[PDB]
């Protein structure tokens, strides 16, 4: 992974040594090349994963998340240009440095072969994420949003460290390849019940799980656009990726310890989907939409079936592109009216005809229109949960109805109707904004032609 | 509110249109339109405001019990099949300021006239502010009606959007 780690590190000298006016052109141009070389990770075999060294490896689960992670950095650079226009030059360079270091930790997190190396890098992503929100956010609530984001994660991560170090002492290793062969069944004792909780609650808070989600509406709303894109697209998937790994050493206790968490997710879908129907903030509506889609991922990882894991992997990639696009769309309007209220600007389809086409496509993928990969991942999870219990079709079905309602509610509220009279500064969409939306939707739709590269190890 | 004269006038118009819906055929409507007029003609004037209200309240109750469930609606009125059918084609005029010069050059005449209106609108704004803060009580205006221009060469206050509003069938 040194072919990806080192060039990412070299983006830091590049930004600081570049001409004052060319910081956005070099970082965007060279970070796009790093994304291009990430396609070499697709040398995946049917039996063995691609093991590089003692420290890093890449199977079909890490690869799509790595390619996604390295693809967002150039996009986040474009979205940040407008609101950093009047920013001091040195502070602006410090912003691009935080985003580079966040990618550096992410690409090492998804590829780490040893579970304590994963923990250190998994926990290291908070510092660059916390700094972006608290320093380059707009509202007063960013400070309180930063504290909520920090202490929800640590409250779960710290027990995870005690469990991970305990597992090494008992098993003698935390290397993931070793665990696939030295894993032992987990007996049903009160001591193991709390080992199970410690190995999962850290990942549950990051998904997030319903009930433990009262930082996503704060962090995903008070953060800058670049923070919202990475918070929603790749940072929520660390919990999903972590569970898809650590459930290997929790069988068979996952059979009964999953019940309270399947219920929170199954009933958390309806609760969060319903919340979106009454939100008075376009950015908060998109944020709650993430808790509903990640609720399907928790259920998919907790039932442990080949179809559920294939559905979970596809859902995480599909959500990342869609949610990142929805935040970008909400930000383009905010950059004009400078307010997050959803009812303030209406009928924008009359003033921004093309930007309203991006709204439609983002909404269609959000409500999982086939054959988009959003539907493929979601469909494979309904098929698997149906076999887990035929009654889950009721809760899956109701959410699909509510998902279509709030997706099209924001499309109708902000694109259709009648334009607000006293809004007279709706300038035409810049080429930067249109290119930003294309770079999400086009790869999302192209994955429909060859979807096996995002279906994970169990394909 | 709406006085007492206006309520009966409004009720009379509704009653005929609801009656027009039941009758459909014009000959029947004329036969019953005058009959319903007579029932209003019986109790014209009649003073006795206290008894006047009783006749109207009874009238409203009768109208409600006998109103058509699906009254005819004009196609372009609230409830009609063509109400707001062209709101999507109505683009404001401030968007033209955002046009690219390469596409303004397609209409050299039209934007020449716009500069006159924009030039006219800027020069007249100051007088319109004066015209409004002089013809208004100390405790702010108490009605939504606006005064005209008390001079020659002065445009009425608050005319830009009233005059320049989008056409009814812009495309």
């Amino acid at each position: 992974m040194l072919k990806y780690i080192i060039p990412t590190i070299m983006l830091m000298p590049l930004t600081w040594l570049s001409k004052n006016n060319m910081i956005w052109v070099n970082s965007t141009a060279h970070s796009l090349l790093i994304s291009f070389t990430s396609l070499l990770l697709m040398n995946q075999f049917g039996d063995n994963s691609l093991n590089f060294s003692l420290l890093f490896f890449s199977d079909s689960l890490s690869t799509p998340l790595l390619i996604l992670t390295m693809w967002l950095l150039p996009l986040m650079l474009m979205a940040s240009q407008h609101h950093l226009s009047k920013e001091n030059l040195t502070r602006k360079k410090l912003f691009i440095t935080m985003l580079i270091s966040l990618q550096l930790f992410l690409i090492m997190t998804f590829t780490a072969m040893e579970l304590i190396l994963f923990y250190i890098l998994f926990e290291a992503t908070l510092v660059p994420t916390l700094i972006i929100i608290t320093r380059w956010g707009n509202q007063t609530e960013r400070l309180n949003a930063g504290l909520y984001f920090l202490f929800y994660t640590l409250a779960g991560s710290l027990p995870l460290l005690v469990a991970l170090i305990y597992i090494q002492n008992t098993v003698g290793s935390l290397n993931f390849l070793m665990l696939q062969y030295w894993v032992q069944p987990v007996h049903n004792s009160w001591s193991n019940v709390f080992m199970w909780l410690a190995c999962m609650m850290a990942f549950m808070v990051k998904m997030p799980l319903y009930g433990l989600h009262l930082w996503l509406p704060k962090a995903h709303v008070e953060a800058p656009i670049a923070g919202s894109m990475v918070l929603a697209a790749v940072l929520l998937k660390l919990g999903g990726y972590g569970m898809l790994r650590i459930t290997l050493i929790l069988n068979p206790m996952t059979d009964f310890m999953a019940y309270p968490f399947i219920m929170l997710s199954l009933w958390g879908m309806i609760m969060t989907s319903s919340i979106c129907l009454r939100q008075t903030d376009l950015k908060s509506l998109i944020a709650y939409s993430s808790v509903s889609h990640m609720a399907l991922v928790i259920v998919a990882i907790l039932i442990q079936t080949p179809w559920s894991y294939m559905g979970a992997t596809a859902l995480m990639i599909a959500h990342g592109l869609t949610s990142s696009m929805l935040f970008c769309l909400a930000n383009s309007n905010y950059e004009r009216i400078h307010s997050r209220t959803m009812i303030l600007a209406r009928g924008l389809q009359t003033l921004l005809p093309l930007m309203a086409t991006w709204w439609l496509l983002a909404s269609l993928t959000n409500l999982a229109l086939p054959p988009t990969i959003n539907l493929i991942g979601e469909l494979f999870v309904v098929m698997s949960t149906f076999s887990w219990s035929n009654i889950t079709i009721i809760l899956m079905g109701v959410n699909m109805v509510i998902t279509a309602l709030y997706s099209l509610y924001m499309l109708i509220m902000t694109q259709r109707g009648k334009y607000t009279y006293h809004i007279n500064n709706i300038s035409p969409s810049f080429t930067r904004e249109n290119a930003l939306m294309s770079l999400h939707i086009l790869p999302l739709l192209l994955l429909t032609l060859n979807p096996k590269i995002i279906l994970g190890p169990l394909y | 509110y709406l006085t007492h004269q206006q309520k009966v006038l409004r009720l009379y118009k509704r009653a005929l249109r609801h009656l027009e819906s039941w009758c459909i055929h014009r000959d029947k409507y004329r036969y019953f339109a005058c009959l319903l007029r007579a029932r209003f003609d019986e109790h014209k004037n009649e003073k006795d405001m206290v008894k006047a209200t009783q006749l109207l309240r009874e009238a409203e109750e009768e109208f409600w019990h006998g109103q058509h469930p699906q009254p005819y609606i004009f196609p372009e009125s609230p409830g009609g099949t063509s109400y707001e059918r062209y709101e999507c084609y109505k683009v404001p005029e401030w968007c033209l300021d955002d046009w690219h010069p390469s596409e303004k050059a397609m209409y050299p005449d039209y934007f020449a006239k716009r500069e006159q209106w924009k030039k006219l609108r800027r020069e007249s704004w100051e007088r319109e502010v004066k015209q409004l803060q002089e013809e208004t009580p100390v405790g702010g205006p108490r009605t939504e009606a606006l005064p005209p221009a008390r001079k020659q060469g002065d445009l009425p206050p608050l005319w830009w959007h009233i005059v320049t509003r989008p056409r009814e069938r812009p495309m």
Binding site: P428 | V91, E93, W99, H100, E103, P170
Partner: peptide
């Protein structure tokens, strides 16, 4: 009698 149809800027 062709009239001017006001549209948002279609150049960008």
């Amino acid at each position: 009698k062709r009239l001017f149809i006001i549209k948002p800027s279609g150049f960008y």
